[PDB]
Amino acid sequence: MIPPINFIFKLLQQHTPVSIWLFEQTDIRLQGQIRGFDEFMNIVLDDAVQVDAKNNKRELGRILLKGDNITLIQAI
RNA sequence: CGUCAAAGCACUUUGCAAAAGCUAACGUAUCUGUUUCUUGCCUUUUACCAGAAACAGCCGUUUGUAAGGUGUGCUAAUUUGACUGUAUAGUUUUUGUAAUCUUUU
């Protein structure tokens, strides 16, 4: 079987593009490649992009998120 | 170990009460006597032989309680009880996703 942090470890090596959803905000989402992370589920995204229901793709740069705000992490 | 409560504390002397509550050594010990019966050895009764049942004494044991004694402390020490006793800002409770607005009855 596949534990959750070992699954995220694969997303670092493969450098796969991953879109991230927020806690109490469906209107907003994010994108980017995963460089690194930690035990508390904080993430360092590279070439991250802010997306909406309108599809308003707005660029950001290399950012960091708090683990308290995530909900879904999905491949491609 | 920690908290709280009570109390002097440890050691000791007497007094006074108790000690099958659901089959169990108040004493991992153990002796004498009385009465009533049964058998022994016997004729003087006592003194005795060795079984029973029913009562008694004696040598001891434990507990609670009361007053004391010695040594120590009453600017402390010790005992005794009681307790829902631990420390976590990063995902399942105590360091917040909250804040704010509007319509309906």
Q: Is A41 exposed, middle or buried (0-12, 13-18, 19+ CB in 10 A)?
A: middle
Cα gap A56→A43, rounded to integer Å: 23
The technique by which this structure was obtained is: cryo-EM
Query: Quick one: tokens of A48?
Result: 């991250």
A12 touches A32 (CB < 8 A): no
Strand A58-65 with A43-52, pairing: antiparallel
A12 touches A34 (CB < 8 A): yes
Alpha helices in A1-76 (DSSP H): 4-13
CATH classification number, A1-76, choose in 2.30.30.100, 2.60.40.1120, 1.10.357.10, 1.20.1440.230: 2.30.30.100
- B chain positions with any atom within 7 Å of a protein CB: 90-91, 97-98
Write out residues whose CB is closer than 7 A to strand B: A 22-25, 40-42, 67-69
Q: Which nucleotide is nearest to A22 (CA to C1')?
A: B97
Element (H, E) at A73: strand A70-75
Q: Which nucleotide is nearest to A42 (CA to C1')?
A: B90
Element (H, E) at A49: strand A43-52
